[PDB]
């Protein structure tokens, strides 16, 4: 009823109500907690800015103001307990940072306090290298992490040891995936210049594809196609598959022939 015979004032009153709900004062004095309401309101205002093309500047301004309210309230803390209750809410169940990056609050995650908590959890188990001098010692550590057989044997034979606890830390998983990528490139280049290498490369790319299978199985297809680097990765692995299957077909044909 307010759309017909009342148009252009319905959108104006809607933008007025959204301008009032998004003030720092009302958001800080009305709800039980302002942080969650503010984040979800910012996402809703962004979605409505995308839907309604007109006044896009206004909804952009409102949601940016709400992002800034969140970042300020997070900055104003001074204790460990406070930053923990803000970043997580009621470090298991680290949720509010996840929702922050899903709603794309840039300046929220990039705050020195959030960054401090992330670099405390990031080097979780080994602290002797968090305070390391330069990146040269880190390069040395990755070169010594190039010794995969020790790690695989110790992981699958007897976990929960000292090396079993070390491998259960994020920096280790990161450097191990980097080392696997590096040695894959190395095998490629070695195979380039002058049978075993061929099968090893094939097994490596099959492992990559199974990793991507476990990846896109976790979410729906839309979430899988959401990113852009995954498309390039998928195309690359499928190209490797096609090339090696062509080589195998040619090999089988020539084998039957000269047999």
């Amino acid at each position: 009823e307010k759309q017909r015979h009342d148009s252009f004032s319905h959108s104006r009153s809607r933008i007025n109500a959204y301008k009032g709900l998004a003030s720092p004062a009302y958001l800080s004095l009305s709800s039980e907690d302002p942080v969650l309401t503010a984040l979800e309101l910012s996402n809703e205002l962004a979605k409505l800015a995308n839907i309604e093309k007109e006044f896009k500047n206004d909804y952009r301004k409102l949601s940016m103001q709400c992002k800034d309210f969140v970042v300020g309230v997070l900055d104003l803390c001074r204790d460990s307990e406070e930053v923990e209750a803000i970043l997580n809410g009621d470090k298991a169940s680290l949720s509010r940072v996840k929702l922050a990056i899903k709603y794309e609050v840039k300046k929220f995650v990039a705050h020195p306090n959030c960054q401090q908590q992330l670099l405390t959890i990031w080097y979780e188990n080994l602290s002797g290298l968090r305070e390391q001098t330069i990146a040269i010692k880190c390069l040395v550590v990755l070169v010594v992490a190039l010794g995969l057989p020790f790690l695989a044997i110790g992981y699958w034979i007897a976990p929960c040891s000292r090396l079993g606890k070390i491998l259960r830390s994020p920096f280790m998983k990161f450097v191990a995936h980097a080392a696997s990528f590096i040695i894959f490139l190395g095998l490629l280049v070695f195979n380039a210049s002058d049978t075993w290498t061929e099968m090893l490369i094939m097994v490596w790319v099959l492992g990559m594809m199974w990793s991507e299978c476990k990846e896109l199985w976790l979410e729906g297809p839309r979430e899988y196609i959401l990113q852009l680097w995954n498309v390039l990765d998928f195309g690359m692995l499928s190209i490797f598959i096609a090339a090696f299957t062509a080589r195998f077909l040619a090999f089988l044909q020539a084998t039957k022939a000269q047999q």
Partner: protein, 32 residues
Amino acid sequence: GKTLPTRYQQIMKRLIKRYVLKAQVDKENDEV
């Protein structure tokens, strides 16, 4: 694991109070 190929209300009250005092003080720094 990827290897190889209550207190809440009190905290919120404290932070909200801090934020309100901060905003009221900052409003005084602006131009006339």
